Amino acid sequence: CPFGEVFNATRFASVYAWNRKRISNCVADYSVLYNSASFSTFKCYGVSPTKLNDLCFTNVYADSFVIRGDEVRQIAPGQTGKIADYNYKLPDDFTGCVIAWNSNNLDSKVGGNYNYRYRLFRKSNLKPFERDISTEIYQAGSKPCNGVEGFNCYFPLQSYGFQPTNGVGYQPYRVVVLSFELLHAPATVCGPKK
């Protein structure tokens, strides 16, 4: 039951490069979800957490990434905005739970981290199941750009500053998301069921 192995990962990827660790063909004890005292948020959308153990899933998933602290409340169905469109779009029929916890004392640097980057602006919402690793140059105007800033040539790459003088909303946080799917296939993962 190697969920703690995912929990204690030393390094985390960028927000645009969220990694999916496939969970299948393993009996899920789900003991890690009990110790919620160390978890900042514990909520589920489209699924009843009480009936998680009593029902069996054909396949299950777990996704881990790092974002800022104040973005926890924006991870909800029916929400719009730049973060909800160009970073991660939640379908109205999403079935899963969103879990995050404090990591400022472990994932913050005095000089500021320069490892998590993404794309600030894009023309439209990301198509489903797309890995947004594109670094296209933003060009609002009709004047062509030669890769160097100038007349109507704005560099779309910006860096964040993690400093002690910053507020609470600049703190780094660990985020882990679990999604359970029930396709037109028989169940393969079952709880211990006492």
């Epitope: 009990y34 110790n35 919620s36 900042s40 948020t41 909520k43 009480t50 926890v72 409340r73």
Partner: antibody, heavy 121, light 110 residues
């Protein structure tokens, strides 16, 4: 359906401790968690301590920790809440409550009749 | 530090809209669940609503609650007040490693 009986001492003079028990009867104690919470007169419910299913997680308030202890025993199918270093501000009514559902401790489900503990003269 | 401020009481004319609110600040209240409890005078507390969307067995169908995202607060409404429904209600929430119970808004049917 759910019936709880509590037995033990009541009024206690300062200088000695008190044996407090919330015996479990009519429900499978070893499958559900247990908690002890305080309800001071007039004021609302105030958290004092919480114990996990295995008891490895014991959390207490910062300003009162070190003296107040929480406990449980699955082997004996009974509940014990040992109170140490009782003061004049610790006089209130006590209750034993089990968590809502299995392995969930963010809510309270059933409250017994409770016991009265007083430290005064 | 997690103190709360609520109105002492609320009353409206019959036929109007009535709700019970426990509005928190210094942090989103919809981030975690809020539990509704009923405390009858001289009776042990009994859960009537849990997780803001489900009712235990035997709970009357007139009990309901939800979350209004416009103001980000928990509202509990009961339609058709009756004498048998008179009790004391409080909100519930847990913050990190401690549990905080709100003052609550009193609903009385006299």
């Amino acid at each position: 359906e759910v019936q709880l009986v509590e037995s033990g001492g009541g009024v206690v003079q300062p200088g000695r401790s008190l044996r407090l028990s919330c015996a479990a009867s009519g429900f499978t104690f070893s499958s559900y968690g247990m908690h002890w919470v305080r309800q001071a007169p007039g004021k609302g419910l105030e958290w004092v301590a919480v114990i996990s299913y295995d008891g490895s997680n014991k959390y207490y308030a910062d300003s009162v920790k070190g003296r107040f202890t929480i406990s449980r025993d699955n082997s004996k199918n009974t509940l014990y809440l040992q109170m140490n270093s009782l003061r004049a501000e610790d006089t209130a009514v006590y209750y034993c409550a089990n968590g809502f559902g299995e392995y969930y401790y963010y809510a309270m489900d059933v409250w017994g009749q409770g016991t009265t503990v007083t430290v005064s003269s | 530090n997690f103190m709360l401020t609520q109105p002492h009481s609320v009353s409206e004319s019959p036929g109007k809209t009535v709700t019970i609110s426990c509005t928190g600040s210094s942090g989103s209240i919809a981030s975690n669940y809020v539990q509704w409890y009923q405390r009858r005078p001289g009776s042990a507390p009994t859960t009537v609503i849990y997780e803001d969307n489900q009712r235990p067995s035997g709970v009357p169908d007139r009990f309901s609650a939800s979350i209004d995202s416009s103001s980000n607060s928990a509202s509990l409404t009961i339609s058709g007040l009756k004498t048998e429904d008179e009790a004391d209600y409080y909100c519930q929430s847990y913050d990190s490693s401690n549990w905080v119970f709100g003052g609550g808004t009193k609903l009385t049917v006299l």
